[PDB]
Amino acid sequence: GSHMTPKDDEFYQQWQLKYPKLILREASSVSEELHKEVQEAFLTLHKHGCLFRDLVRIQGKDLLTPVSRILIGNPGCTYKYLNTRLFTVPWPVKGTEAEIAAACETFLKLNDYLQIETIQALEELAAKEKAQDEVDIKSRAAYNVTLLNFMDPQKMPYLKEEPYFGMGKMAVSWHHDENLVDRSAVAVYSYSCEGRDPDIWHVGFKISWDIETPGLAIPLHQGDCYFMLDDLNATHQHCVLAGSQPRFSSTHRVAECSTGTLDYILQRCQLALQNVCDDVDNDDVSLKSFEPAVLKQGEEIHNEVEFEWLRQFWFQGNRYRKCTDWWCQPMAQLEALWKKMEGVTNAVLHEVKREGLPVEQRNEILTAILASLTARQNLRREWHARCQSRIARTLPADQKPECRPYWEKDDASMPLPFDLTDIVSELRGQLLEA
Template identity: 60%
Template sequence: FLFQWKTKYSKLVFRKSDTVPEELHQMVQESFLTLRKHDCFFQDLVRIKGKDFFTPVSRILIGNPGCTYKYLNTRLFTVPWPTEGYEIKYCSPQIHDACKALIKLNDYLHIEAVKALQGQNLLESKETEDTPVIDREQNFATSLREKGSVSQDQSSFCVPEDDFTSLNSRTSYNVTLLNYMDPLQMLYLKQEPYFGMGNMAVSWHHDENLVERSTVAVYSYSCEGSPAEETYDQKLQGRDPAVWHVGLKVAWDIETPGLAIPLHQGDFYLMLDDLNMTHQHCVLAGFSPRFSSTHRVADCSRGTLEYIFGQCELALQNLQTDSNSGALSLKSLETAVVKQVEEIHNEVEFEWLRQFWFQGKRYLKCTDWWLKPMAKLEEYWRKME
């Protein structure tokens, strides 16, 4: 197990719950329960291979104001966490506190990810090919026992400024996708097909629409001590089906053994550098309900309000208003200009307005922050129409 982890999955960093400040645990876990109590988790309607499905996992996206995240053809809109310079009205003080706790977790995981990448770089530069495998495995096992993680705390490292800027940008999380699932409420869970790992809450996949080589950080909170866990006392080999796990495999490879890491209350893990692209991961269900907070550097080059408002203003440069009648008309009828305007028109309608409204009034359970910008987008759309 340790040999496979070290040689095939070395960019997966795992940290036990006792490495995280207890105060942060308490704040974050209370935020999960608060959002659940206020019915803020929703199953997403997604499209896979041309067919529409509701996800078995319920989710909510929290992050930078005006930021969105798209996966499986569905665009999610952030419930904005408290951000300086933005006026955000939450539906209750409890939801404000929950979002505030999650940005604190976000800041903590950012720092831990930078440390882990620094440690990874140092290990790669020091490790030589003639180092005996048994020595590397022994050192790895010692690190895992002593630190509760794959790589040690490297907070004292000194790195060049350019390298630090790169590490910082690849770990500056702008969104977190929160997940909730109670396996006992599911009528059916798909079986892991390649390694016999058992029930899957989330099938094998890469995370989509992320900044290249950015780190993904996942904090896990399973409601341990549930009646289902307490009544389960079967001796078995391999993965304990009562415990949640994250599974990893080399992408498009079922010959290399997969890895299943148990996740207990308050553990977190990091998928460093290009691991999300070279490998696939899944989530293996346990018996108890589970929350997770998955922090990502979303590629927002086409997914922010700033971007889409800029596109609208570009399109409306071709619009003129008659000074007498107030009627609108086009300045230019050149094919390239008209085509560009229509492409922006369609982008506003199909990538923003329809995506927002088909999800109903889910966001109003947390905040009305998105209503004004969406009204502004509708106004732009009417002018382009």
Template identity: 60%
Template sequence: MVSAFILSAIGQEPRMKRFGKYDRAKESKKQKLLKEIEDRKLPYLTPKDVQFEQLSKAKYPKLYIRRASCVPQEIHQKVQQGLTTLQDYLVPAADESNTTSIKGRDPAVWHVGLKIAWDIATPGLAFPLDPGDCYFMLDDLNMTHQHCVLSGMQPRFSSTHRVAECSSGTLDYIFQRCDVTMKNLQKDPMLGIPSLISLELDSVKQTEEIHNEVEFEWLRQFWFQGKRSAKVSDWWFEPMALLEKSWREMEQMTKLLLCEINEAEWSSERKHQVIRCLLPYLEERQELRKSWMARCQSRLARSLPVDEQPECRPHWYNGDSHMPLPFDLEEIISLLSSQLLSEDGDVRS
């Protein structure tokens, strides 16, 4: 049991391999600690130790244990109903022949082991968990500490639930964002010619910000792994098609704004204000498109099987009559930048 604590708390591996300075430093730190530990075992305390309560409050205050008696009975019943059918098929018969106590910890009782990350001097804690108990890792505890479950001898099911902040990052959220943008687009009821309702800076900023969010946080993220996700489910293709339709409208809105800048009888000050508002979003869009293109064409991406390779989408070639603007925005950015040149040659004065 103690060796399991060591392996889970210090030797755990991430699900996805990442290669970078941070990861190499982290791996180096882990190997250094493992070398220092050698065959020794990590110190840890249980409720039977005198210092347990004091250390728990001082070093581990963000772990909250909620005992089964505090959990509503209907929740226990629903969980039990959902897991009962699995028990006969998935849980082997338990061997309860070894009931030796391990340093004050009954091996028949489940515990949650917790320790400060990369700290082999401060003792860890082993909190006992009775059937039905819950534990909560509050605030940034999961970032600053390492934890594991020390399973007892009795077969038992467990589940992990994460509470996420979901005011953004959901389909409802991004569809609402698209609806906000579309409210600034109108079409002539007779001719169907589109135009922008507002050219105020706040409207420009909002439209272009959502434009980039849809393209880079949703469409390109999805199509980078779309072929692989399609093997599991094709559910996401419909909402992505709707988002891409809105994104095409936003491309049209950007073109309409560029036309207004070139044709509207604005003062130089007004024109420069709009260009200064628009230009950073176009520059960001250009750089991110280049970055995503490079990812999709990287050696690692091309080494994947053909049906798993990422797709650079949306993508089109300059001059495509079906698209309002070119994929490569370099020329447009250059033209807008030149309009910000002052008489003495200073850029973006």
């Protein structure tokens, strides 16, 4: 098991014959106007301390990313990898701080450019496949976010070795980019500060399943861009090989956000609250229907807003409040919507305890809502635990994994306990009463 770089004669023909959906556009191809603007944006962003290592989960384990990052993109958009939902600090799409919003404006135009370069290469790539479709192409380049990366190999000197082709130290281990639109492209701007050369940053590629076809290590210099086209991200894996100097990168993606925008999730909540009499906002929640399919939907949306949104957000300690206040209000509103749903749940629970309610209808209600209440107990445990791992305590005071929402047994404001174990036990019991 070995690797190839431009030092090798076979490199170029291997690139052409076994990795042709990968494109390099060296630093020369990018206007010098742009290079300075985005390199300042990286630096300003870093200075204001907008880049955090993410507390991520993989194969059951809580791990911090070697790399520090921030997600920038369309307002209300999220990008989710390794069970962690990153929320965009927004960029001036038509429709917070002066210095910070300058960097975001910058990466938006980077986005515009990379998108342009991408559509072109996709057009060329299709043209080489002759020896409507233009909507497919344009959508697969419609980058809606970029995830920025930073590492200092010296200040962060805790790097794994590459296991298969001897490529050396990895800033990022072998992976596929998750949560991307099918066959959508990825475009990376690489900003270094200064066998394969250990001091230089590379991106590495291999075929999935394969450690016999030699991998490519491609040198990345200050300002070089690369592009993963079409199904490349699915058929191959990539990693980042660290150099010795620090480096930034901006990875532009077409996030599959069909259940991952603010608007999507507000609409979901609003769909749940249609089962609620909504003349007035108080604690006396009254439901229009107890048809199983509707109660189930309500409880599923309840879970969705709680775990994919509130807890994901608060798990990162409102670290983005340093960059924008953008999510602050929407997250308050989702909490407020969530609390009403606790009201809904409580009311369903009330109706299940009602005398003059035929067991048949009661058991139909139980069977509809049981899986959701179960999933809700287990995930509440998981998030509680994940919030209090010693790896999470070690973190600073502005990134402290807050377990929100959380309330004590004596809390008069909440109609239901955080711990649903007794509630769940009982409902399960009644369903087995024969």
